[PDB]
Design a protein around this ligand. Structure first.
Ligand code: CLA
Ligand code: CLA
Ligand code: CLA
Ligand code: CLA
Ligand code: CLA
Ligand code: CLA
Ligand code: CLA
Ligand code: CLA
Ligand SMILES: CCCCCCCCCCCCCCCC(=O)OC[C@H](COP(=O)(O)OC[C@@H](O)CO)OC(=O)CCCCCCCCCCCCCCC
Ligand SMILES: CC1=C(/C=C/C(C)=C/C=C/C(C)=C\C=C\C=C(C)\C=C\C=C(C)\C=C\C2=C[C@H](C)[C@H](O)CC2(C)C)C(C)(C)C[C@@H](O)C1
Ligand code: SF4
Ligand code: SF4
Ligand code: SF4
Lengths: 729, 31, 40, 75, 80, 69, 75, 40, 142
């Protein structure tokens, strides 16, 4: 059989497994038949072009559907009272009740309500009309076409890059720092000052008249004469109304700090100076490494020079290890991307940048949950692909006595102390929670163990939170740090001391307990991933694991039993802990913000100290409207979310039987079914081409994990959206 | 103001180009 | 199933192809390809 | 067996158990909601689990608190 | 088909050959051990990969190792 | 060199007793390429799933043992 | 024989705890107004709240095994 | 009897005896001095 | 000025309102009054329950420091007696049999000698036989 063309051993398989594994190893280019390094790199280049084109097409589709079936031009007239529309509904399976229920947001047909928060983003960046959205969609279509053609071209024989071109770290770093990061940020700052701010102040600026409309009145002379302060004079007053000329200043680069009084979001001019400054810094950074002139650093000598007397060989030979190994680079990139996605979530829920996005609680919750889940997935993938590197691309002799080898030396100490910290957190956190539960249940909630989060409150004070009376640093009015004449200090101190936003929310004993539980989850997931990565090469039970690859089922029932001794199994186990930690995180965030938005912070404050309050006040209480989306009486707009809630519960349940029941049972059952088919008249005329067999052990684990994760995500998303929409939306 | 039917049809026709380019890229990558 | 957006007749014809015609054609082509014995 | 005991409990509460008035009228524990709710899974989830779990989630501070504790223990 | 390898740490206890249910292994004369015999895998196309030979091996680490590879009808042990 | 009763440390780097200490139960003097027999107090993982014991004896070459006694 | 001995010990314990720590004599006079109860909880760490009011001035854990009705039927 | 002494000294008997000793200590202390949140 | 959000329980209106109806934990009829008295000196939140402050300050040493020292002493006692008994039985002829059948005489002899566990531990560390060298421990292949 032809398929799969990249693996002969799979193509000669006569069973249905050939269909499955061929899918699973399709995009693993290294293990393909007759694969060279150069071909691998070029194929990766083309595939990355493809993913970029897919991203651009997805964004174009978002824009086009919003412009076509949305209410963008009506939404901007009243962002605080109109639900944005995602896309239209066309379902012949609908009934009259569903049609009436889903005709919402002033539409004339069944429509969905957008929760990605793209309306606020488009409004903030200056898009105000449907035709602008349409032009953006068409331009993104053209851009995706260009990138697809670029992939095809650089895949052609005359345009195939050489191996040396791919292994040019210095030139890539210089171009991608100064150009990709710096020039793009500078262009965004120029877009903000030339277009976004004038449109926010009522002046319409487009391609038609942006050449005849200067950003600043006395423009482009002070920048070259050095009198930059002119661009900071006359900022937007506190009475400014977004999108109008009432109370609007003329400054284009400010450091006001805090939030816009009306939109409850960061000042646009602050964003302009911020992106300009980081563009300048990135452009400076991009002139660091030597490419083909005399000046510039070289990464290899920097790495080979930083060696100490305690670590042995230090960072020697690390340049070759990183450059020759693609999995090392992928793991580093995934770790960094996950960290900065977590950063995006944490600094975006507390410092909103888009106008009126702080008042749309549903979109805020959705965005936080989404980007935090993405960050968790990326953080898991970093460790997984690092373990893959250790299995495949790690050379012990080359990286001898350096830090990479030193990691595998005290790996037992690493795992032991990690196990100790995980157990130490878990025991004394579960003990405190159960103690509070038991004490509260016995009718004496006064004997609870409530620890004030003193250190985090001290940090809040050091940033300027004057509620705990710590009187330290920025909270100290006489401290040198608070008497530097910083232009952002008044606005920042005003915003931090206001209780109307999420900027440094007040904390208590429940936040202490839940943050320590999150710490337990993080350390346990790290323990699983790290032990898998370090034991991937081998352990006492399997000294020769590297010979068996990264993912293998087991080594049989002998020598104890094996049963998930591979590093792929470590990743598979760590996915569950990642999901559990993300669940705790999102539960804490959502309940705290429900209390904040309703003004009933005391409910969370006094009910989060014991687990029964979590079970009753959060889960039981907030499901009242969700599960009533469709009743024996009728149907409301939350019907789809109730259906998806049950759907997620069902898929989560279904994953359990790929996770618990194992292969031999189903193999024998399929044997019986095969007998039944072969012995049946009028069905013997039809025969299979691939012999039906049960799913393999690793495939079964993967499928169970997939159903599990899909159910988890769908259930929580449905519950969160339904609860927040019913409460506030 | 809301779009027109001609705009939607033109968007479809424009999107017909990245479809052809993506088909070519997929065939090239399969090779 | 009835909409007020411009060119509301498009989903009347586009969705079925994405619903039935495209999935069925893709099923048939992939099934033939993965089952085509030989030549690799 | 879980489905069996759930069916028994809900049907007993909805169609048999209850209070009889001196007139003779019968008011059931959960009224006649079994007939029109037990046909969908959402009905089983909302009118049986969520509705009737109130007495076990609100048991803290009273003589039934132990049950509530044990409830969580199971979970 | 799967691969079966026998390393020079074999002591010629013949437990692996006895434990094999599909007659894949054999005992051939040798000189490296006191028993002067070592295991062999001539009929390796019939191996299913049950790892019974590995379970039977008493050395500190298995002197006989089985590496699962391409899957055939025989390797899957199918009766249909 | 290694005789009966010799306490030796194992340096096979893949055996269960790498770094552990054992005692020389016997040495066979011929062309055998793993002539030393070392027995240990601890037992390895050898055995079917559920077995209550492992193996406390193994064969090693002379070069992979360090005399301690 | 051993399992029979264990079951006999269980039955004797049930009868003793229904004879000493129960309101069976109280419940017998007023069966429609007194809840059965045969387990009493020591007050040590606040678990004395489990000793709810089962009627008739008796404080104890309500039983659901139905031993009181069996004993009344047995005479 | 020596056999009875050896049986009494087995792991489960020792672990349960020590657990009841500790539990009795804690219960008696909590009875005679309850509600000790901190050293006052 | 520390803990501006935490007030003394002796004046917090919520604590005083809720302390009248404190439940009796034991059979003693005035255990609730004793608890209210003992907790009136703590730092109550807006909901009237005591809060423990753990930052190193000695004014609130009773919250963490004293129980910490008590637990550390007890846990060190337990660990030291267990380790000493293990090392002692390791020289016998059936160390595993004495693991499941406890040598009660020797067990209690080690039980009663654990109150000087810090001095024994520091002498052990100085003698160098508390911690084994890395080259004398079996290790898994890297
Ligand atoms: C990936 C982006 C994306 C997505 C998810 C959707 C989603 C949808 N569109 Mg849509 N659309 C998009 C981009 C997108 N659109 C773009 C860019 C255009 C301009 C050409 C349109 C034009 C369009 C029209 C004219 C109509 C829809 C309709 C619909 C709905 C019916 C289902 C469908 O797509 O089939 C029908 C739609 C198409 C087949 C449009 C072609 C798809 C685009 C052009 C290419 C996307 C390729 C994509 C990246 C492939 C990813 C591969 C990956 C899955 C492995 C659905 C909500 C219908 C609707 O409103 O029903 C209520 C409808 O009538 N779309
Ligand atoms: C019998 C049940 C049923 C069915 C058939 C549908 C069908 C539909 N609903 Mg719907 N709905 C239902 C019940 C149902 N609904 C219920 C009970 C509710 C709650 C009241 C809703 C609420 C609802 C809303 C709110 C919306 C719909 C929409 C839609 C349409 C989406 C178009 C589509 O699927 O293309 C897109 C197809 C896909 C995305 C495929 C995804 C599934 C596969 C498995 C993923 C692909 C995996 C893999 C890569 C496949 C490889 C390729 C393959 C060929 C091999 C479609 C007509 C939407 C609509 O009208 O917009 C057009 C919409 O907005 N429905
Ligand atoms: C100035 C020259 C230049 C530029 C612009 C690029 C640009 C790019 N190169 Mg590149 N490259 C260059 C020179 C350059 N290269 C040279 C000289 C070499 C040879 C040494 C290479 C060799 C090379 C290889 C080998 C590869 C690339 C690839 C890529 C693409 C990766 C996708 C990406 O990062 O974009 C997306 C990311 C960004 C735009 C910035 C990252 C986002 C930041 C970090 C955080 C987010 C900021 C902000 C908050 C997010 C916006 C929020 C908003 C949505 C609201 C990208 C388009 C890859 C590819 O295949 O692409 C086709 C690839 O594999 N490059
Ligand atoms: C830029 C990101 C990136 C890139 C380029 C790669 C690249 C690679 N990874 Mg990697 N990985 C990543 C992120 C990434 N990964 C992350 C974030 C994780 C953590 C989740 C992993 C976890 C991971 C593991 C555990 C393994 C790889 C492997 C691989 C290699 C090839 C096998 C493969 O993935 O194809 C095959 C991929 C698939 C068959 C994916 C199937 C899963 C589908 C997409 C789920 C679909 C869900 C379903 C449709 C939901 C329907 C919903 C509907 C009902 C509504 C390849 C080098 C494998 C390897 O060792 O190769 C060297 C391997 O074992 N990766
Ligand atoms: C609610 C369920 C639950 C719980 C409590 C645990 C608990 C634990 N898991 Mg775990 N796990 C779970 C679900 C759970 N897991 C699931 C679903 C998966 C996916 C398969 C995993 C996958 C997983 C992996 C892969 C790993 C763990 C690890 C751990 C340990 C880390 C230490 C810790 O968190 O606190 C400390 C432990 C606790 C708080 C639990 C003790 C709780 C009891 C009540 C203490 C008292 C015992 C009691 C007196 C016994 C009486 C019994 C008697 C009545 C018969 C711990 C034992 C890691 C580990 O071993 O770390 C060393 C590890 O590597 N687990
Ligand atoms: C993905 C797109 C899609 C679309 C556009 C439809 C559209 C439709 N489905 Mg449907 N369906 C879908 C996916 C889809 N389905 C999926 C994925 C499932 C599996 C769960 C089903 C399962 C399903 C059932 C079980 C039934 C339908 C029925 C129907 C029809 C009811 C409306 C009507 O007036 O009936 C009458 C409509 C016609 C007579 C027109 C026939 C359409 C052309 C002419 C056929 C050629 C309608 C044409 C019903 C039906 O077939 O009614 C006859 C019905 O009983 N659907
Ligand atoms: C199934 C049988 C059963 C069960 C579950 C109970 C359950 C109970 N009885 Mg009860 N009882 C039973 C049979 C049973 N009884 C019988 C047959 C009699 C008649 C003799 C009694 C007479 C009786 C009285 C007189 C009292 C109870 C009480 C109680 C309650 C307190 C628990 C208790 O006594 O522990 C108390 C704690 C202990 C016994 C711990 C002591 C240490 C133990 C024994 C450790 C065991 C090992 C020990 C070191 C000895 C070593 C042995 C080794 C050689 C093997 C509890 C609800 C009390 C109650 O309800 O008061 C309100 C009470 O006062 N029972
Ligand atoms: C960052 C974590 C951290 C750590 C490790 C410590 C550690 C310590 N603090 Mg401390 N403290 C912290 C944060 C921390 N503090 C913060 C954030 C505050 C402000 C609320 C304080 C306010 C504080 C006071 C007021 C006092 C301590 C004291 C102490 C010491 C107590 C000595 C003892 O009992 O043993 C101990 C070294 C005591 C001291 O001076 O010890 C010398 C003391 O009186 N702490
Ligand atoms: C907030 C998180 C806090 C917990 C995270 C992890 C806690 C782990 C701390 C244990 C000590 C780590 C091992 C020390 C590592 C070790 O001692 O390496 C030796 C190293 C001294 O390095 P040298 O100056 O010899 O040279 C190192 C470099 O020159 C190149 O290797 O010590 C440090 O750098 C300590 C700082 C590491 C941080
Ligand atoms: C000796 C002994 C053993 C062994 C012991 C060993 C080997 C111990 C080894 C320890 C090592 C290697 C490292 C230890 C590190 C300890 C640290 C880092 C302590 C930090 C303390 C801090 C940060 C105090 C913090 C604050 C201190 C302050 C008083 C307040 O609270 C507030 C608060 C909590 C912030 C056993 C286990 C075998 C048996 C035992 O019985 C005895
Ligand atoms: S994974 Fe399955 S086949 Fe492998 S050892 Fe475990 S039970 Fe046996
Ligand atoms: S794996 Fe099984 S079939 Fe293959 S050689 Fe070993 S015992 Fe024989
Ligand atoms: S079981 Fe191991 S030692 Fe014995 S003959 Fe087979 S390979 Fe050699």
């Amino acid at each position: 059989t032809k398929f799969p063309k990249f693996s002969q051993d799979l193509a000669q398989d006569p069973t249905t497994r050939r269909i499955w594994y061929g899918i699973a190893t399709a995009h693993d280019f290294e293990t393909h038949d007759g694969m060279t390094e150069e071909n691998l790199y070029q194929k990766i280049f083309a595939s990355h072009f493809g993913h970029i084109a897919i991203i651009f097409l997805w964004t174009s589709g978002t824009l086009f559907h919003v412009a076509w079936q949305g209410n963008f031009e009506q939404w901007i007239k009243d962002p605080l009272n109109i639900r944005p529309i995602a896309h239209a509904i066309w379902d012949p399976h609908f009934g009259e009740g569903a049609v009436n229920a889903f005709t919402q947001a002033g539409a004339s047909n069944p429509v969905n309500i957008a929760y990605s928060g793209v309306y606020h983003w488009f409004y903030t960046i200056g898009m105000t009309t449907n035709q602008e959205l349409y032009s953006g969609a068409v331009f993104l279509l053209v851009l995706a076409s260009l990138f697809l053609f670029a992939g095809w071209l650089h895949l052609q024989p005359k345009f195939r890059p050489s191996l040396a071109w791919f292994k040019n770290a210095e030139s890539r770093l210089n171009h991608h720092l100064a150009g990709l990061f710096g020039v793009s940020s500078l262009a965004w700052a120029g877009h903000l000052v030339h277009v976004a701010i004038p449109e926010a102040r009522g002046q319409h600026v487009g391609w038609d008249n942006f050449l005849s409309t200067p950003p600043h009145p006395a423009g482009l002379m002070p920048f070259f004469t050095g009198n930059w302060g002119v661009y900071a004079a006359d900022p937007d007053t506190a009475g400014h109304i977004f999108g109008t000329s009432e109370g609007a200043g003329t400054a284009i680069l400010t450091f006001l700090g805090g939030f816009h009084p009306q939109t409850e979001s960061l000042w646009l001019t602050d964003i302009a100076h911020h992106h300009l400054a980081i563009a300048v810094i990135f452009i400076i950074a991009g002139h660091m490494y030597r490419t083909n002139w005399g000046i510039g650093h070289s990464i290899k000598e920097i790495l080979n020079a930083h060696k100490g007397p305690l670590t042995g060989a230090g960072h020697t030979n690390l340049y070759d290890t990183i450059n020759n190994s693609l999995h090392f680079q992928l793991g580093l990139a995934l770790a960094s991307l996950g960290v900065i996605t977590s950063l995006v979530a944490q600094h975006m829920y507390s410092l909103p940048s888009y106008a009126f996005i702080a008042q749309d609680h549903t979109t805020q919750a959705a965005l936080y949950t989404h980007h935090q889940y993405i960050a968790g997935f990326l953080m898991v993938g970093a460790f997984a692909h690092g373990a893959i590197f250790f299995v495949r691309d790690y050379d012990p002799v080359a990286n001898k006595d350096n830090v990479l080898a030193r990691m595998l030396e005290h790996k037992e100490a690493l795992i032991s102390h990690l196990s100790w910290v995980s157990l130490f957190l878990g025991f004394h956190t579960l003990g405190l929670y159960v103690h509070n539960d038991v004490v509260v249940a016995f009718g004496t909630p006064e004997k609870q163990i409530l620890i004030e989060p003193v250190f985090a409150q001290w940090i809040q004070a050091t940033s300027g939170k004057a509620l705990y009376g710590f009187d330290v640093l920025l909270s100290n009015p006489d401290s040198i740090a608070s008497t530097t004449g910083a232009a952002w200090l008044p606005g920042w101190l005003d915003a931090i001391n206001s209780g109307t936003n999420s900027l440094f929310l007040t904390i208590g004993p429940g936040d202490f307990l839940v943050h320590h539980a999150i710490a337990l989850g993080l350390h346990t997931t790290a323990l699983i991933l790290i032990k898998g990565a370090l034991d991937a090469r081998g352990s006492k039970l399997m000294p020769d694991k590297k010979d068996f690859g990264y993912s293998f089922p087991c080594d049989g029932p002998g020598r104890g039993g094996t049963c998930d001794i591979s590093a792929w199994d470590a990743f598979y186990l760590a996915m569950f802990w990642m999901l559990n930690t993300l669940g705790w995180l999102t539960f804490y965030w959502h309940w705290k913000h429900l209390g904040v938005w309703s003004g009933n912070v005391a409910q969370f404050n006094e009910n989060s100290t014991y687990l029964m309050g979590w079970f009753r006040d959060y889960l039981w209480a907030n499901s009242a409207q969700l599960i009533n989306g469709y009743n024996p009486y009728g149907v409301n707009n939350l019907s789809v979310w109730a259906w998806m809630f049950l759907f997620g519960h069902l898929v989560w349940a279904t994953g359990f039987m790929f996770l618990i029941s194992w292969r031999g049972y189903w193999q024998e059952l399929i044997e019986t079914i095969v007998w039944a088919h072969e012995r049946t008249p009028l069905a013997n005329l039809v025969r299979w081409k691939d012999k039906p067999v049960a799913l393999s052990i690793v495939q079964a684990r993967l499928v169970g994990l997939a159903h599990f994760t899909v159910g988890y995500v769908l259930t929580y998303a449905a519950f969160l959206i339904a609860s927040t929409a019913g409460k506030f939306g | 103001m809301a779009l027109s039917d001609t705009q939607i049809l033109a968007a479809l026709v424009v999107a017909l180009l990245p479809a052809f380019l993506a088909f070519r890229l997929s065939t090239e990558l399969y090779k | 199933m009835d909409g007020s957006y411009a060119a509301s007749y498009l989903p009347w014809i586009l969705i079925p192809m994405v619903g039935w015609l495209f999935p069925a054609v893709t099923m048939g082509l992939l099934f033939i390809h993965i089952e085509s014995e030989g030549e690799g | 067996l879980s489905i069996v005991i759930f069916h028994f409990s809900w049907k007993m509460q909805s169609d048999v158990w209850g209070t009889v008035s001196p007139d003779g009228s019968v008011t059931h524990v959960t009224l006649g909601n079994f007939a029109q709710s037990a046909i969908t899974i959402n009905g089983w989830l909302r009118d049986f689990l969520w509705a009737q779990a109130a007495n076990v989630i609100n048991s803290y501070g009273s003589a039934l608190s132990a049950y509530g504790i044990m409830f969580l223990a199971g979970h | 088909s799967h691969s079966v390898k026998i390393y020079d740490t074999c002591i010629g206890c013949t437990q692996c050959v006895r434990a094999c249910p599909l007659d894949v292994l054999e005992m051939v004369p040798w000189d490296g051990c006191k028993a002067a015999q070592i295991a062999s895998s001539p009929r390796t196309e019939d191996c299913v990969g049950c790892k019974r030979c590995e379970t039977a091996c008493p050395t500190d680490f298995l002197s006989i190792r089985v590496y699962l590879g391409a899957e055939t009808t025989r390797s899957m042990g199918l009766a249909y | 060199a290694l005789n009966r009763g010799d306490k030796v440390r194992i340096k096979r780097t893949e055996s269960y007793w790498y770094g552990d200490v054992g005692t020389v139960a016997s040495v066979e003097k011929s062309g055998i390429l793993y002539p030393v027999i070392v027995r240990f107090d601890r037992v390895n993982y050898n055995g079917f799933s559920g077995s209550a014991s492992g193996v406390n004896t193994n064969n090693f070459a002379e070069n992979e043992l360090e005399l301690v006694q | 024989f051993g399992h029979l001995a264990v079951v006999f010990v269980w039955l004797s314990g049930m009868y003793f705890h229904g004879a000493k720590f129960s309101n069976y004599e109280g419940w017998l006079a007023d069966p429609t107004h007194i809840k059965p109860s045969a387990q009493v909880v020591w007050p040590i760490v606040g678990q004395g709240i489990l000793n709810g009011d089962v009627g008739g001035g008796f404080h104890g854990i309500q039983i659901t095994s139905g031993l009181f009705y069996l004993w009344r039927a047995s005479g | 009897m020596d056999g009875l002494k050896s049986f009494l000294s087995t792991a489960p008997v020792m672990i349960m005896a020590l657990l009841t000793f500790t539990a009795g200590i804690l219960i008696e202390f909590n009875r005679f001095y309850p509600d000790l949140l901190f050293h006052p | 000025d520390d803990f501006a959000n935490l007030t003394p329980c002796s004046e917090n209106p919520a604590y005083l309102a809720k302390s009248k109806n404190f439940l009796n934990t034991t059979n003693d009829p005035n255990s609730g009054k004793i608890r209210a008295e003992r907790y009136a000196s703590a730092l109550c939140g807006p909901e009237g329950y005591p809060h423990l402050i753990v930052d190193g300050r000695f004014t609130h040493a009773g919250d963490f420091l004293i129980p910490s020292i008590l637990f550390l002493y007890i846990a060190g006692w337990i660990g030291w007696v267990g380790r000493s008994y293990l090392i002692e039985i390791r020289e016998s002829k059936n160390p595993e049999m004495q693991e499941v059948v406890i040598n009660v005489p020797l067990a209690i002899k080690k039980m009663l000698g654990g109150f000087l566990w810090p001095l024994a531990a520091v002498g052990e560390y100085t003698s160098g036989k508390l911690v084994m060298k890395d080259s004398e421990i079996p290790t898994s292949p890297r």
